[PDB]
Symmetry: C2
Subunit: 453 residues, 2 copies
């Protein structure tokens, strides 16, 4: 049996057509260094997605590898249950709280973003029970938001591909509009007026459901998996005013935006969000270890703490919560981002990326170029006036991602948008190569379509 | 300022009274080796729980540490999304399928047991939708079952401490009886007759709810966190007959029983279970890495595969699913358990543990001694005839666990029971020291409850 045949025989792949997988088999990645990964045929690819929006320090950071080794040789596993603790969880929790963009009280650790959002749902239910508000339990999120894949976090998620066939969302998980001007604004509507309508939609939803029943609003500062969607100017200001009016918690899902992706340390800084709760993962450890973190502010902690006393202990925890190797690696990761000034470097590299893409702004298949900091997307269309796809929605995106791979670059299609989320350590020449490989994929796609006109 | 002050300032602890934590602060564990961990004062403890039922190879296995290093220096992160793959996920998946106690088709990887059970819930809903059985969605689990802490997996969990204040269980998550003879059998009732009644209870629950609405039955072969509860003889045989009668999937939650804990490689082998789906974690990697695995049989895979084609792709996955470092470490872990014959060693050490504990069978505070393989529990009671607690359920267990810690042993209280789940590598004299530290804690507890 080849390694590819064993993969087909034995693995059910996430986010894969399992039948198509049996026909095509895997693309096997063997090794990585810097921004590059290599398949088992020796072909090199720029990982323009940093794997899953996540590998901040690239694929061969020796400081993270040595930090793991040092913690393995000290204490390779322990837990935080029943007052037990360990230095790496303590020092990471200190660093996260002290770097938070708003006053935060406590950190709770999980393995995944999905577990973290699932945990926030439980914590908000627990909190509102503690405060004697037992009706105050519904969550509001957005169409095309991504918050993970547990039964509860896939209910916060607003992407239909995460819900169809899974009987989701659960009751009590509500969705308001995707704040994407290009796709959902009225013809000739300003960003500010689009923001007004989205804030009216949220308030009308709160009033229709009964304000006393709405616990929390959750949003990525800018939406990652849903299309690299930058919210319209004044959106977050106007949404937060509605939330504060009805005593609704604001949860910033920073799993992608966290640690320098958007031009500042946090998306909450870039977009002027004052969240009660923040969720962090992915770049937290450059994904070298599975870890996520929840930051809760004083009011959330105090109500949870009170009830944990009344009921004996907080009845919640994962075996891996605060895992000493995962926390040790994340701690070293955050030190490197600070010591190497990678927030500012990412901002400078993002200006080069966006300038490079904008040479194609009048291309007949380029509908929108969006992003900020070191996250971007190009949304392709078959027709710029109607914004209609070429053939089925997703055709151009899939074709572009296929061509990008052939030209030695891994991007991700989100319908007809192709994403860019390179490692923060990407250098100026490397940004040049990412845009060159985009241009080659676009040329191939243009020849395949034949736009004429 | 001190590390303890920083912990109090910055960390919300799982499974902790947060207010008592602000007063007492943490017990900081600095380092581990073999079956031992050490606090920041240099005091050594036998980790009689292997951390969280999990550290099979103990706290200083150099082969796991080198396996991590080697994978880190090759490919420290990649994913399995959109047909991407990597060698350690492939070779671990191969090994898990080829070692499975019943024919299995595919492995799906997660970080946690909770994520894995949450994923099984979604897979069963997805499957029954694919098969055109949209009503076939309810799960049956058991009182005192532990299946993790997500909104959905805490609904499978049957421990009130996991549900009170969290508005759980969700609708469609049903519970039948805890198969604990000592607590739930009628006067003079045999194990076999207790099993008969539990099988009737399950069938009656299925008929009351409508069989066409029941998707799955999930059980730990023996219940870990809920009390180290060994099911009565013939339970699993009779429960499976009921499940097969109504076309209900049998899910074996092997997160604690997996990889030699119960005297054989799997709890499904020890208890004669033929599951459709198995869930594995904890000893999978000796918890050196967060990883869990779901094994699905051919019919579950075929229905999910068909739906994943109809819907374009399987719309499910964690960033960490099959993480190359976590999979490389788990693969090496399973090789060590096989190469070092730790299943047979654990069985031999478990006989010593259980015989050592059995000397306390006539102690006036010992209500029951239970276990199987290298997992055991001693349940304390304030009165052996009535089986009543002292003051309130949990009072004895809390005090016992605290005294065990003072005598250099970390155990875990499950109400008034203290658990034993030592690393598989524990030696004979180390089992003797576990029983001695238990005995010292029991003496302390006896004097504390007093005359
Ligand atoms: C990736 C992601 C998650 C889920 O994290 P996992 O570790 O994959 O479960 C949640 N929210 C956002 C915004 C994400 O991008
Ligand atoms: C520990 C455990 C789980 C949950 O695993 P986590 O990794 O802690 O989420 C599930 N089932 C059983 C039987 C367990 O013992």
């Amino acid at each position: 049996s080849s390694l590819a045949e064993k993969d087909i025989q034995y693995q059910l792949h996430p986010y894969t057509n399992a039948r198509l997988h049996q026909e095509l088999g895997p693309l096997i990645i063997e090794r990585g260094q810097g921004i590059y990964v290599y398949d088992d045929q020796g072909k090199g690819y720029i990982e323009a997605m940093a794997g899953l929006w996540s590998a901040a320090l690239g694929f061969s950071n020796q400081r993270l590898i040595k930090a793991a080794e040092q913690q393995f040789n000290t204490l390779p596993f322990y837990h935080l249950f029943d007052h037990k603790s360990h230095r790496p969880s303590i020092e990471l929790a200190e660093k996260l709280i002290e770097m938070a963009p708003v006053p935060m009280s406590k950190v709770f650790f999980t393995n995944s973003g999905s577990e973290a959002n699932d945990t926030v749902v439980k914590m908000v239910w627990y909190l509102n029970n503690a405060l004697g508000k037992p009706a105050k339990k519904k969550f509001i999120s957005r169409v095309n938001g991504y918050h993970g894949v547990t039964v509860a976090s896939a209910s916060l998620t607003g992407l239909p591909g995460n819900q169809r066939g899974f009987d989701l969302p659960l009751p009590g998980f509500l969705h308001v509009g995707c704040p994407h001007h290009y796709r959902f604004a009225l013809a000739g509507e300003s960003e500010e007026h689009f923001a007004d309508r989205l804030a009216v939609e949220l308030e009308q939803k709160i009033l229709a459901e009964g304000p006393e029943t709405i616990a929390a609003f959750i949003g990525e500062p800018l939406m990652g998996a849903g299309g690299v969607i930058v919210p319209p100017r004044t959106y977050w200001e106007k949404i937060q005013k509605v939330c504060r009016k009805y005593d609704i918690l604001v949860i910033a899902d920073e799993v992608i935006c966290g640690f320098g992706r958007t031009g500042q340390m946090f998306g909450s800084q870039t977009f002027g969000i004052q969240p009660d709760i923040m969720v962090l993962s992915k770049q937290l450890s450059s994904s070298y270890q599975p870890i996520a973190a929840i930051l809760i502010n004083a009011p959330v902690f105090e109500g949870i703490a009170d009830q944990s006393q009344a009921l004996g202990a907080l009845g919640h925890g994962f075996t891996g919560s605060g895992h000493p190797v995962a926390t040790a690696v994340a701690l070293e990761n955050l030190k490197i981002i600070e010591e190497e000034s990678l927030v500012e470097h990412a901002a400078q590299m993002g200006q080069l990326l966006r300038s490079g893409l904008q040479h194609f702004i009048d291309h007949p298949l380029v509908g929108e170029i969006r992003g900020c900091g070191l996250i971007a997307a190009v949304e392709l269309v078959g027709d710029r006036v109607s914004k209609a796809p070429y053939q089925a929605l997703g055709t151009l995106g899939r074709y572009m991602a296929g061509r990008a791979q052939e030209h030695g670059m891994i991007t991700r299609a989100m319908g007809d948008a192709v994403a860019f989320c390179p490692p923060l350590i990407v250098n100026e020449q490397e940004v040049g190569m990412i845009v060159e490989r985009f241009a080659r994929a676009l040329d191939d796609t243009t020849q395949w379509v034949g736009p004429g006109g």
